[PDB]
Swiss-Prot record:
<dbReference type="GO" id="GO:0003735">
    <property type="term" value="F:structural constituent of ribosome"/>
</dbReference>
<dbReference type="InterPro" id="IPR001515">
    <property type="entry name" value="Ribosomal_eL32"/>
</dbReference>
<comment type="subunit">
    <text>Component of the large ribosomal subunit. Mature ribosomes consist of a small (40S) and a large (60S) subunit. The 40S subunit contains about 32 different proteins and 1 molecule of RNA (18S). The 60S subunit contains 45 different proteins and 3 molecules of RNA (25S, 5.8S and 5S).</text>
</comment>
<keyword id="KW-0687">Ribonucleoprotein</keyword>
<keyword id="KW-0963">Cytoplasm</keyword>
<keyword id="KW-0689">Ribosomal protein</keyword>
<comment type="function">
    <text>Component of the ribosome, a large ribonucleoprotein complex responsible for the synthesis of proteins in the cell. The small ribosomal subunit (SSU) binds messenger RNAs (mRNAs) and translates the encoded message by selecting cognate aminoacyl-transfer RNA (tRNA) molecules. The large subunit (LSU) contains the ribosomal catalytic site termed the peptidyl transferase center (PTC), which catalyzes the formation of peptide bonds, thereby polymerizing the amino acids delivered by tRNAs into a polypeptide chain.</text>
</comment>
<dbReference type="Pfam" id="PF01655">
    <property type="entry name" value="Ribosomal_L32e"/>
</dbReference>
<dbReference type="InterPro" id="IPR036351">
    <property type="entry name" value="Ribosomal_eL32_sf"/>
</dbReference>
<dbReference type="GO" id="GO:0022625">
    <property type="term" value="C:cytosolic large ribosomal subunit"/>
</dbReference>
<comment type="similarity">
    <text>Belongs to the eukaryotic ribosomal protein eL32 family.</text>
</comment>
<protein>
    <recommendedName>
        <fullName>Large ribosomal subunit protein eL32</fullName>
    </recommendedName>
</protein>
<dbReference type="GO" id="GO:0006412">
    <property type="term" value="P:translation"/>
</dbReference>
<dbReference type="InterPro" id="IPR018263">
    <property type="entry name" value="Ribosomal_eL32_CS"/>
</dbReference>
Length: 125
RNA sequence: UGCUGUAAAGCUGGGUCGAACGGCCUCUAGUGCAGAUCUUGGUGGUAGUAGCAAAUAUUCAAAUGAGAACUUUGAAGACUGA
């Protein structure tokens, strides 16, 4: 890791928690919802039903919020926004906002390279 | 196209697009939908399916026309039957 050393990153659940019957009807979005029905086999946790979010799945506090390269990600919208990362260049990477213009985006990439700040999305227009 | 969060969700790459929009500290509410034989609008399967069968009945040729079972003219066969 080019970032500050960290323990090996463990994700307890890497799949997505999909709402029950979001596969069955178009009108049911996958955004997680808790079943509140009296008979619900999912709420009652029958064997064979879907995993549900609970606090036991929480990430280890020492590796939480880290991307695979070992950095926490900070959203940058202009050149000046890079400054708060100046003393945190081995633990915080910059991410350029989607709405920054192509002119200003080139300027942010240049300044980050000047300061030694990692950028997570360099290829943007 | 990926990243973050147990999650509600947040961010990002590519495309489309054309005029406004967001973070943070707070304020406020007509603030979150799968259901209500919910409301309005839109759209399927059914399905090229049911079906288009009462009132005797139509036919040949020419003309017209891009095109004629269905229009017009001629020939005829019929019917209403005062």
């Amino acid at each position: 890791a080019t970032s500050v050393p960290h323990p090996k990153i463990v994700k307890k659940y890497t799949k997505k928690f999909k709402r029950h019957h979001s596969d069955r009807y178009h009108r049911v979005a996958e955004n997680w919802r808790k079943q509140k029905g009296i008979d619900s086999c999912v709420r009652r946790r029958f064997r064979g039903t879907i995993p549900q979010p609970n606090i036991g799945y929480g990430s280890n506090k020492k590796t939480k919020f880290l991307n695979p390269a070992g950095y926490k990600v900070y959203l940058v919208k202009n050149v000046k926004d890079l400054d708060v990362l100046l003393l945190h260049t081995k633990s915080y990477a910059a991410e350029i906002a989607s709405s920054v213009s192509s002119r200003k985006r080139v300027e942010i990439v240049a300044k980050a390279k000047k300061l030694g700040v990692k950028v997570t999305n360099p290829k943007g227009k």
